[PDB]
Design an enzyme around this catalytic site. Structure first.
Site, PDB file in Angstrom:
ATOM      1  N   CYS B 170       0.785  -1.223   0.000  1.00 15.28           N
ATOM      2  CA  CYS B 170       0.000   0.000   0.000  1.00 15.28           C
ATOM      3  C   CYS B 170       0.815   1.271   0.000  1.00 15.28           C
ATOM      4  CB  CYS B 170      -0.941   0.034   1.195  1.00 15.28           C
ATOM      5  SG  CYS B 170      -1.708  -1.525   1.502  1.00 15.28           S
ATOM      6  N   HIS B 310      -2.877   8.064   6.264  1.00 13.55           N
ATOM      7  CA  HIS B 310      -3.080   6.826   5.538  1.00 13.55           C
ATOM      8  C   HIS B 310      -4.542   6.392   5.722  1.00 13.55           C
ATOM      9  CE1 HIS B 310      -2.171   3.196   3.442  1.00 13.55           C
ATOM     10  NE2 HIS B 310      -2.371   2.425   4.500  1.00 13.55           N
ATOM     11  N   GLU B 321      -2.125   4.522  13.582  1.00 15.47           N
ATOM     12  CA  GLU B 321      -1.683   5.804  12.981  1.00 15.47           C
ATOM     13  C   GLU B 321      -1.879   7.018  13.924  1.00 15.47           C
ATOM     14  OE1 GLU B 321      -3.396   6.743   9.138  1.00 15.47           O
ATOM     15  OE2 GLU B 321      -1.866   8.312   8.845  1.00 15.47           O
ATOM     16  N   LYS B 339      -9.356   8.351   1.876  1.00 14.35           N
ATOM     17  CA  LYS B 339      -9.983   7.042   1.636  1.00 14.35           C
ATOM     18  C   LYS B 339     -11.458   7.023   2.038  1.00 14.35           C
ATOM     19  CE  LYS B 339      -5.566   4.480   1.893  1.00 14.35           C
ATOM     20  NZ  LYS B 339      -4.714   5.706   2.090  1.00 14.35           N
ATOM     21  N   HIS B 344      -9.517   2.709  -1.037  1.00 18.83           N
ATOM     22  CA  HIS B 344      -8.150   2.250  -0.945  1.00 18.83           C
ATOM     23  C   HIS B 344      -7.725   1.632  -2.299  1.00 18.83           C
ATOM     24  CE1 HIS B 344      -4.517   0.981   0.683  1.00 18.83           C
ATOM     25  NE2 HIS B 344      -4.910   0.314   1.757  1.00 18.83           N
ATOM     26  N   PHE B 403       1.046  -3.057   4.234  1.00 20.71           N
ATOM     27  CA  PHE B 403       1.238  -4.419   4.733  1.00 20.71           C
ATOM     28  C   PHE B 403       2.667  -4.859   4.544  1.00 20.71           C
ATOM     29  CE2 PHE B 403      -3.063  -4.141   2.906  1.00 20.71           C
ATOM     30  CZ  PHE B 403      -3.789  -4.223   4.083  1.00 20.71           C
TER      31      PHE B 403
END
Ligand SMILES: C=C/C(C)=C\[C@@]1(C)SC(=O)C(C)=C1O
Ligand SMILES: C=C/C(C)=C\[C@@]1(C)SC(=O)C(C)=C1O
Ligand code: NA
Ligand code: NA
Lengths: 415, 415
Positions: B170, B310, B321, B339, B344, B403
């Site tokens: 990502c 993010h 986060e 997002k 995403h 990830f």
């Protein structure tokens, strides 16, 4: 002036450990002794896919010691092949380095992969076609993501200063070492595990490169097939590999009592923007990658005693690289083409050859380029052949070029 | 002292053009106006694979304008999807930049990809299973190699100072911008095209992330499903994207009369070494990526007016986060989670969000985070919501985590 390693603008970076698995041996020092003895890792392929498809190519070098001979059931089911190779090599390298306890926050991993080792996506479709979406594993994502091998090694060794995966086909393993060097000289890390991994020889890659006329079909004499720079070359031969090195600042090595094997002085990355698969015949941008490694190192072409060639044994590839070496002013260097003995391992090969360049500098010897019997007028290089050449090699450049026109040159020095 | 952008140790680097295709619009300025108007790109999925598998997830954002509506027969047969997206976006960006003639030898391309867009390997097997090895195309290699999208763009625009592809799930699109910035500040390039591309929404990725409980299943109200930082969030929603930006030294921009949209000041790349898929709850290494971008920029946390989060809307992701933003001392910044509106897009999303961060700085406005109705005590951030917030945003950090534990933070400044 601009910063260089020679002028102290970049910190000194050393190679302190190496590991590789090859078609000759799982032990890098045994590979090296084998190369010096003129051994080849290339044999007749016994895989049933060769006869099933009656492939034109019937030769190649499988690993002497298969990765999975070291892998238990959990790893076989929960990791991709390149992740298993990474785990294996990562553990071997760390042990070779004396299992040091480093600051995780100053420790990076950069590991390239090549053209696939791509088995885990298909297996997920199949699970779903039969059993539905609830039959895909919650482990599918970690096995399929292309950062997976570097991620496994980062998690295994505890690297918290970045875990990166560059992809540039055949240059990915060298490009990984290049980015690791950058991460250290820019101050993001003090220590890095770096290199490349690749899947085993399979039918589809052979078919795809064979159809491009890129591969040797000298099936009668497998060990004689790979002939980089020779007049009678007829393409590359696949030989499996994975390779990693440990690099760190000289002061970090000194502080923990690690004896350096060599210095990593500079790296150059350029691109041909010429063709999707073929190299530019003029060798100009490839040459410039060499020149850039010298600029960053603070060396002149006259300092370069040795070039570890990309040297795949394709007609157009070797010709382009001879031009590149001329463009970079390095055509008086002693040239070795290890693919003559070890074949081409795509994403891993640049890393393997960087390790070999390190051993050449450490030991003051270049193995013979196998099958080099008839020099080619268009090449006009000083290619080491017949028996090992012992010499005072002070500085070397390892070349690795990849389909797509990706050029990576790494400058190493004797420690 | 160590070099920083503020202290002149690195050259000034500016963003001079942007392009993106999204679930709201093919035109980036129309995406932006849509975001400001509170529009969502997330709808009910009409794909037959949803009903075929009765997938738990029945929502997502397909591109408003499909890539292939711009693609002829030759491109459809001879390029992968991500290569076609790259060609499309590369051409759009170059035109937006005024089609400049640059020195190819100072021009790099860095483009990330994510979790696949992986169709071309299977098609090659099939050709071979039926017709034999001579039925694979001599074009297979260029369509399958994972450097393919960056290679297409490099060849299209004539980039000879390196063509790179970082893979970090990502964060790949942000990491691409990070490496492009490095390539310029280290002196390897003066101009770079950078960003990320990704394939479309498909069944296997939905199944794989759904089985991890990572995805929202609020199928009744598609536009309300993605709720980053909200008390009632229940995972991410996929929304398709690709995005590229043009960056160059300020003097190069000045010399050709390009008006900068923003400054790219620094980049930080770290890693969690915690888990293969889940972020570390403490947010410490993610926070440190932010801090590193500030160090390189020459900024303090107090300078950061805005964070483009993010913000995927997973329970554990958003919580981690919030901790990271605290660790970095940036918890007084105005936070946007795009997002919420755009979903995403994995390999592309960091690049898209870097473009949005640029537009926020240019226009002095942050769009509302959609669906943010109930603040979460564990988050405790200043999340922009309800209607756009007009403000004096001088500096911003875009976060993108992937990830594998890959953390990338980019520091941008108003020009
Ligand atoms: C830039 C290099 C290109 C495009 C192709 C090369 C030389 S790289 C390689 O590993 C092989 C087998 C080739 O033929
Ligand atoms: C380091 C981050 C990790 C491991 C996972 C994150 C937060 S990144 C991402 O895009 C999603 C959906 C997650 O859940
Ligand atoms: Na080499
Ligand atoms: Na962001």
């Amino acid at each position: 002036s601009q910063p260089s390693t020679a002028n102290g603008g970049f910190p000194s970076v050393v190679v302190t450990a190496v590991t590789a698995t090859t078609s000759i041996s799982p032990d890098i020092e045994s590979t090296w002794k084998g190369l010096l003895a003129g051994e080849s890792g290339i044999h007749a392929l016994e895989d049933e896919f060769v006869t099933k498809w009656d492939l034109a190519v019937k030769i190649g070098g499988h690993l002497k010691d298969p990765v999975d001979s070291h892998m238990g059931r959990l790893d076989m089911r929960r990791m991709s092949y390149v992740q298993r190779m990474g785990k294996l090599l990562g553990g071997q390298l760390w042990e070779s380095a004396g299992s040091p306890e480093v600051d995780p926050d100053r420790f990076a991993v950069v590991v390239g992969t090549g053209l696939g080792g791509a088995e885990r996506i298909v297996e997920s479709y199949d699970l779903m076609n039969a059993g539905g979406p609830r039959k895909v594993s919650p482990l599918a994502v970690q096995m399929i993501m292309p950062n997976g091998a570097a991620a496994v090694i980062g998690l295994q060794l505890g690297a918290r200063a970045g875990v990166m995966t560059p992809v540039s086909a055949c240059s990915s393993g060298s490009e990984a070492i290049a980015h690791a060097w950058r991460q250290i000289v820019m101050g993001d890390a003090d220590v890095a595990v770096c290199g490349g991994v690749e899947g085993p020889i399979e039918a589809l890659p052979i078919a795809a490169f064979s159809m491009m006329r890129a591969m040797s079909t000298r099936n009668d004499e497998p060990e004689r097939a790979s002939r980089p720079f020779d007049k009678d070359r007829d393409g590359f031969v696949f030989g499996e590999a994975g390779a990693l090195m440990l690099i760190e600042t000289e002061e970090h090595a000194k502080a923990r009592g690690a004896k350096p094997l060599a210095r990593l002085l500079g790296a150059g990355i350029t691109s041909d923007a010429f063709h999707m698969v073929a190299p530019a015949a003029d060798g100009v941008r490839a040459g410039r990658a060499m020149t850039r490694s010298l600029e960053l190192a603070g060396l002149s072409p006259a300092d370069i005693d040795h070039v570890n060639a990309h040297g795949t044994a394709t007609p157009i590839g070797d010709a382009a690289e001879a031009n590149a070496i001329r463009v970079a002013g390095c055509d008086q260097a002693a040239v070795y083409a290890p693919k003559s003995a070890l074949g081409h391992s795509i994403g891993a090969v640049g890393a393997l050859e960087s390790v070999l360049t390190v051993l050449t500098l450490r030991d003051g010897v270049i193995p013979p380029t196998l099958n080099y019997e008839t020099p080619d007028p268009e090449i006009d290089l000083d290619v080491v052949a017949g028996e090992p050449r012992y010499g005072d090699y002070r500085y070397a450049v390892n070349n690795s070029f990849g389909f797509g026109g990706h050029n990576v040159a790494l400058a190493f020095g004797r420690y």
